[PDB]
Symmetry: T
Subunit: 144 residues, 12 copies
């Protein structure tokens, strides 16, 4: 699996997670509501940035980003969430597991782009790893 | 078709159009590139607001917003765009036709919510009509 | 009961609730203290805006707003709170019930002002309903 | 008289009042000069917004806004002011009477647009009524 | 009369004056309307800060602030104003006399808190005296 | 023709051009719509500043600015535009010719005010020439 | 009297007027107190800028600005004000007469600097004339 | 123990608490993570201000602030925390006890500086007491 | 010498020092020019604040501030500086000695206002001491 | 060719391109004038940053940046543009080819600095590649 | 030598001085490093503004600005600096002499543009003289 | 020595240098006082950021940051400074040598993290090297 393919799969994961976290946003229950509600807004606004970043990296490489939701659904490795009620504990557990998935995928992006001498994608992959590793650390602490 | 059903169909249209306009964003060609590129960013940021607005209106009404992309695709009336190259003329024509569709749908939202005495949804529907009518006017002028 | 009378009763409720929520502000206990303390500040600052809005709507209609606390106490439908210690759960339950009361009263304001052809008051009533319905939704979620 | 006709007459009134209030701006006498001078600036900047708002509402409806001063003068119901010296009392009396005129005209705009099912114009008419009713209240108080 | 008692009486005066000055705000007549209207807004926003400051000082001392309007009315030394029409001269005279009252009361707060070694309350009392003495000076000049 | 007369004729031209450019604003057609629409807004906001500047210069000189639209129409040298549809090319050509006219008139203002020793008007005339010469240069480039 | 001499006399007038207007600031009586108090602050902050501007112009010319109050008093043409109570009418009359004096002096600065080919001082003199002529116009209107 | 000695001991406590609270910052566990994490950042940024304030007060008095960590450790009365995992409850209890300690020490600073006639240090001590008393109140409420 | 007398003498010192430091501002020589030039601007802007503060404190006490430069010169204890060339070393030495003078005078203000029970003036005196003691410390370091 | 040599050649290219793009800025013709004019300003402001960045990287490495235009002209690989009239199409083609050149040169900077273990220059080279690749993508789209 | 020729020679001087001052920026030695480094940045950012100003003035006059570095070098009267190490004293001396040169050249620009009746260029020349005369004054003081 | 060990030693160096530079801050002597005083504040605010950055990197790696000053003192390689008086020359020499030390240590962090495939730490190490290399360059210039 080569660089543009990894990016396209990640673009698909970003839009799917943009959606899944909106679900958490709307359907969180319990007294720390304002907190989760606030934090989920910042998270899905991050996914939409990731989505746009990945797409423009694909274009700059000479390839076509994904341009439909059905292609997103075809290419994603993320399970969509159908439940409609959550406490902060359940939401943080879900987001953690997805963060861990993305962390593995950005690690492969980094390593594969290095093998092809694509320095700009390495730098981009390494910047996302830094953000993911920090969020994973924080979420791991929420659950302890 | 009752108020929450109309809202849910519109929520589905917003996410699908959020995606379609990203396509225009990435794939516009020609010398007014910066202009289109800039304008499409403002448009899909509007769809994501519309998406979140509609969802929270659905929740406040006691119902569940849509929480998956496959439900978006099931409920939408919008055709997804598979082409990957455009000039500003082609993009503006597409966006106009979709604006006209939404304008009809928000008109039905307004009228149906009035029949049920749902004043808050009327006000919301009427605010979106004002924005749509202004954008339609402007787009109609781009194409003249 | 006619438009200016409904407004005056609501003006009385706003000042009384401005006070009741200060009580919650000062007397909240437990580890989410900063959260409640912050949120109550935003709530009673909203009541004081509501108080000033209702008063100036009364004046514009040709009538006198209420100008004393004893008239507030005479006209209010809100029970004053004498307790001086609370957790976030108790505070959110109280505020919800009062929000529901105001929501019924703004609904009557809307309907009565429509019967008299007072469009400006309808618009104002409908704007407050939108805010109340959103806050009710959120508070209902805090308690689930 | 139908919706676009009422709007066009109002567009004509806005430009004429934009001018009349500049006259007050320049020609106010007495020790509260800074006050009037300041307030008239805010008033004619409001008329120019009203002028541009009405024009773009006319365009969105499929019709042509007025595009010349002589058409403004043909269609206006406002008497132009030829005097060149005033105290604050004289200025506030003039502006009040014109505000009352506009308030009647926006009331007809609201009612006529309702009869045609033009929701966006109703909302716009109702927003201007709210501003006019507040300014009328204040000006009525200046003169008491 | 000991420190917390003086504070509680002052808390009662602040809410009562918050109300009385709203009356001036709404019911001022004459050509300097914008001025009074503006100044009264800044004054009652000061009383609400004073109200919240005094309450939190009471809490920090281990005691309960007042939490109802009827307790405000029981403890206040301020006469509520029932009239509903004023010129700037009448309003400034009223506010001056109330400022003088508060100045005497904050002087006693300062002296009593010194006798108990309550340095934080002294500093707070002395800060309010500085504000009151400046406002008294200015109001005394309005009336000369 | 003496200084105050030249200023008054220019005041008349500014209001007439304020109007003519609103026409361009509303009635521009073609794909660079956002651009023209944006630029015309900045242009007529400049004319309204010019209008107010000229008027206050007239007042400071001891004379009366023009205070009616019919006096504007009597004194102007600008032809009002009755057409209601344009491309950017047609709009820029129109605005250029009017800029050239104003440039000649501000040159006469400068020279005549110098002959009377009116230094403040010279400085003002010279500042407007600088702005006009820059805009003329730019518009001349649009059409090449 | 040559350029640096005119500047030095003006520097002396600026500091003396800085002081005289502080007197007005502190000692104004009557209900428009806030207005005068505000306006005098802006006026003496202008004199202190004028003072610093004139001084640095003197230095740039190779000469020494005045560096003591007694030299200010020796060189000034302004009468110091010993009274300690005023209404807005008395204050505006005083400031007008001093503005007229400065206007004559800046006119001589302009003409003398022209005779010596000192373009920078001309430009500076002409900028102060513009400010003075505008303030004179406004003050003349306060007194009508 | 004289004024500069009390200040130096407090400087030592501030740096030690700056460190201890970083520990809480990094090692907090549980779902209100964002809250604690946020609040601890604001707390240790306060200690570093206190540290710099105390040091510059010592210098202004003619003495040397502490300039090494080992001198901090020699002079501090605060126990360093070696544990590396906490919930919000444990953190708030720790911070409260340290706040109470500092409150006693600033009380002695105030009283000792009064005995020496050092007014600036009294004012500084009294300002820190106000902040400490407010934070103690809030923390006491977190634990109820 | 009683409180208002001490204040009036200090008002006289502030205006005289405002002037003396302008001299330093204009006439500093050497390579750290920008530094001194910058710092002197901040210093004389402080004196003008001190001047206005002292004056309004005098007024609030029922007395007349000084309103002429000749009264400033009569009452000041500060020697005016006639030299017109300095290095940073000479300027800092001068400013230090004047700071020390003011520090003694504000100490007497504090002590005398305490004897009369004038708490607001004490607080004001103590705030100026804090600023003076900090500046003295810094200037003493410049010269070491 | 070693790291400092590559940097110095790039410094020479940046100043030469800073100049060439000013030419485009001034001499662009056609109706999208504002667009090009705006974009060229942002481009040559980027070259001047690149120029200063490269120079300070050279200095930090122990070597001398280029300090004359004739050394710029000696070392540059960029052809200077002598034509003085362009449409947006011609300008974008020119800038693209130069962007491609710089992209090759920054790729060599990256690879050579890696061979010498100069991590800071690699990071800097990789950051410029990211910017260049994005601009190349966009310009390539302008021309399609 | 006529107006456009003088401007073009000055454009050449601005780019050459932009470069020479970058040299000072990078190569200043000694403890006031931050100061020089800061000041040189502000100076060469001024030259680049001067460069762009002169160029656009040339274009507005109907002529071609210089568009290559070799034309800059051909037309300049400024000696390029080849040294690569300086103290603040050496840098300020260099910049002063170049400021004096530009001051003579802008004086000729002013006088020649007056002879041709080119008012806009006079105003521009006179504005640059004001800036140059102020900087010359300051630099002359650095060296005393 | 492995990655987390290098980070922990650096965390210890950051807190120790945070302290040492406070010493320079407080105890600098001579006329460029404001400069050093300002620069040291920016430097120790950088160390506290470095301290917090290193700590959170340690936590994200699964290890415990240092949480006591005595552990800082145990692990540091930096000599604490006991002197209490300095000129800018002495301070800059000290800070340079410590910057050089940190530069060697961040180089080892980079190389060791590369050997373990820890990309996020490499990126972080390389970002600190860039800052250190720039500061070293500047400090080296201060001392030349
Ligand atoms: Fe994008
Ligand atoms: Fe939301
Ligand atoms: Fe209000
Ligand atoms: Fe518009
Ligand atoms: Fe609305
Ligand atoms: Fe509060
Ligand atoms: Fe105006
Ligand atoms: Fe000018
Ligand atoms: Fe200055
Ligand atoms: Fe400090
Ligand atoms: Fe204080
Ligand atoms: Fe004042
Ligand atoms: Fe730089
Ligand atoms: Fe430009
Ligand atoms: Fe942190
Ligand atoms: Fe990076």
């Amino acid at each position: 699996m080569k660089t543009f393919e990894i990016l396209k799969h990640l673009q698909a994961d970003a839009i799917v997670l943009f959606m899944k976290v909106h679900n958490f946003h709307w359907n969180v229950k319990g007294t720390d509501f304002f907190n989760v509600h606030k934090a989920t807004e910042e998270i899905y606004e991050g996914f939409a940035d990731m989505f746009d970043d990945l797409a423009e990296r694909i274009a700059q490489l000479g390839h076509h980003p994904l341009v439909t939701l059905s292609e997103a659904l075809k290419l994603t490795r993320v399970k969509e969430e159908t439940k409609t009620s959550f406490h902060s504990k359940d939401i943080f557990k879900e987001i953690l597991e997805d963060y861990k998935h993305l962390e593995k995928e950005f690690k492969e992006l980094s390593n594969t782009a290095e093998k092809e001498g694509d320095k700009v994608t390495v730098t981009y992959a390494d910047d996302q790893l830094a953000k993911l590793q920090k969020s994973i650390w924080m979420l791991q602490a929420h659950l302890a």
